[PDB]
Amino acid sequence: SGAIYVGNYRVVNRHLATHNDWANLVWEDSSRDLLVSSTTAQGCDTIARCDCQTGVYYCSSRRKHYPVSFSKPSLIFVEASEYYPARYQSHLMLAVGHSEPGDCGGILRCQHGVVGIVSTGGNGLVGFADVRDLLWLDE
Ligand SMILES: CSc1ccccc1N(C)C(=O)N1CCC[C@H](C(N)=O)C1
Ligand SMILES: [Zn+2]
């Protein structure tokens, strides 16, 4: 679980969006596993605008923040789960790190701010949904 709170926006994994989220929708993309809903109060997260490939992510299944190197946002095969059929997920970055289902929503941050949120994983892999291209989150 977890979200990004920037301006009057709440950014969550689309597969974990609550009933309150769909009733206040701004934008969603199934192929990216992202959903953005509107908020009444202003949030304080800053979105990174960079091409960093090193950062720190929060892993709820270990209660630890880990430093990682991560790939550039790409179209990557994601196996079928209870939330999506087998498909390519776009704008996804992989790192070598622990993750389990339950860790989705953990923030990945670099020196410039929020880069993305945990969205997928594997044996010793963790995947993050990038948000650095969503320039409109700033305005
Ligand atoms: C952190 S998720 C995880 C971690 C280790 C191992 C497996 C997973 N699973 C199952 C995973 O990748 N998911 C389930 C949630 C939806 C994901 C998606 N964006 O399509 C696919
Ligand atoms: Zn950066």
Swiss-Prot record:
Transmembrane segments: none annotated. The active site is at 15 (for protease 2a activity), 33 (for protease 2a activity), 104 (for protease 2a activity). It catalyses: Selective cleavage of Tyr-|-Gly bond in the picornavirus polyprotein. This is Protease 2A. Zn(2+) 1 binds at residues 50, 52, 110, 112. Homodimer. Cysteine protease that cleaves viral polyprotein and specific host proteins. It is responsible for the autocatalytic cleavage between the P1 and P2 regions, which is the first cleavage occurring in the polyprotein. Also cleaves the host translation initiation factor EIF4G1, in order to shut down the capped cellular mRNA translation. Inhibits the host nucleus-cytoplasm protein and RNA trafficking by cleaving host members of the nuclear pores. Counteracts stress granule formation probably by antagonizing its assembly or promoting its dissassembly.
